[PDB]
Assembly symmetry: none
Homo-oligomer: 65 residues x 8
């Protein structure tokens, strides 16, 4: 289990909402052994969610659950 990584205007958002229920990364279980969540990048969540120029480098994730 090996991972490797190498590296060498106007944005207008207007929102009008009355009711907002938002879930991002969700993991639900009743009977389980393991629950694993690795976020090497970006998790952006909300009623109004904006991501600009995110995750622009080098990331690596190795999991052996």
């Amino acid at each position: 289990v090996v991972a490797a990584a190498e590296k060498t205007g106007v944005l207008y958002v207007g929102s009008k909402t009355k009711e907002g229920v938002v879930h991002g990364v969700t993991t639900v279980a009743e009977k389980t052994k393991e629950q694993v969540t690795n976020v090497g990048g970006a998790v952006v969540t909300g009623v109004t969610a904006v991501a600009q120029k995110t995750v622009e480098g080098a990331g690596s994730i190795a999991a052996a659950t």
Copy 2:
């Protein structure tokens, strides 16, 4: 299990909503052994969700569940 990666205007969003229910990356189970969520990139979630210039580098994920 080996992974490897290498690397060497106007955006107007306007939204009117009354009710919004949003789920992004969801994993639901009742009987299980393992639940794995790797995000080397980006999960952007919402009633209004804008992603600009994201995940522009090098990423690697190696899972052996």
Copy 3:
């Protein structure tokens, strides 16, 4: 379980909301052995959520749960 990584305008957001319920990275269980959450990048959550120029370096996550 080995991970490695190497590296060598106007943004306007206006939001009018009355009711907002937001969850970011969520892990729920009833019977389990292990619950793991590594955040090498960025988890950005809220009724208004803005991420600009985040996760631009070198990150690595190794999990052997």
Copy 4:
């Protein structure tokens, strides 16, 4: 379990909310052995959440739970 990492405008946010309930990184269980949360990057949570120029260095996380 080895991890290694090496490295060598106007932002306007306006929000008008009446009710906001926000959760960031959440881990809930009823019977479990282990619960682990490593934060090497950034967790930014709130009714209004703005992250600018965060997680731009070198980070490594190694968990062998």
Copy 5:
């Protein structure tokens, strides 16, 4: 203008609503001389409106607008 008047169980109401906008006796004008409203009886108004055994006597209205 003459008017004259002379006189000699289980009621279960259950209601579930989310949004209710109710008007009763309404009189709207832009250019007028006279606006008259006589209620010798009963005006009962609402999202849930119940009237039981009302206006059971003697009433008289004489208007000469």
Copy 6:
């Protein structure tokens, strides 16, 4: 302008509402001479409005506006 008048169980209301806007007897104008409101009986108004055994006598209204 003459008016004359002469005279000689279980009620359960359960209501569940989230938003309620109620008007009763309303008189609106922009240019007018006279605005008259005589209530000899009963005006009952609200999100939950209940009237039981009201206006059971003698009432008279004489208006010569």
Copy 7:
């Protein structure tokens, strides 16, 4: 302008509301000469409004506006 009048169980209300805006007897104008409101009976107003056994005598109203 003459008026004349002569005369010779379980009530359960349960209400669960989150937001309530109520108006009873309302008279609105911009340019006018006269504004008159006689209440010989009863005006009962509110988010929960209960009127039991009201206006059961003798009432008379005479207006010559």
Copy 8:
């Protein structure tokens, strides 16, 4: 302008509210000569408003406005 009047169980109210805005008898104007409000009966106003056995005698109102 003459008026004349002559005369010879369990009530449970439960209310759970979060926000209430209530007006009873309201008279609004911008330019006017006269504004008259005679209350011979009863005006009961409130977020929870209960009237039991009110206005049971003799009442007379005479206005020559």
